[PDB]
C-alpha cells in the first residue's frame, strides 16, 4: 500500500510521469517518491530485523 501511495506527488506511477511531465522537470518529484519508498522500506527492514 505504501508503494501504491503517491507520497504527495502528482502520481504514483513513474512511467506516466516520464511520458507526460518534462524530462528536465519531475526530477524532484521522482526523488521525493524514491526517498519516501526508501523510508518505508527502511522502516520495514528495521521492524523485520
Amino acid at each position: 500500500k505504501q508503494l501504491s501511495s503517491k507520497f504527495g506527488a502528482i502520481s504514483s506511477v513513474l512511467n506516466d510521469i516520464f511520458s507526460r511531465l518534462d524530462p528536465p522537470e519531475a526530477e524532484v518529484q521522482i526523488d521525493r517518491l524514491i526517498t519516501g519508498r526508501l523510508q518505508s522500506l527502511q522502516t520495514y527492514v528495521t521492524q523485520q530485523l
Binding site: 506511477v13 512511467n15 506516466d16 516520464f18 511520458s19
Partner: protein
Amino acid sequence: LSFELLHAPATVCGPKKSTNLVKNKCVNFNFNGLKGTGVLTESNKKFLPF
C-alpha cells in the same frame, strides 16, 4: 489548448505510428503511451462494458 486526462478513456491520442498486434517475442512493451511490465495473455475475467 489543454491536454489532460479524465475518467473516460482517451479517445484522442498523439501517437499514430505503425499499428501492430504482433507477439511471440520477449523484449519490452508499451501500452497507451505508458511503459510497464507484463505479458499480454488471455483474460478469463470478463470486463464490464464501461
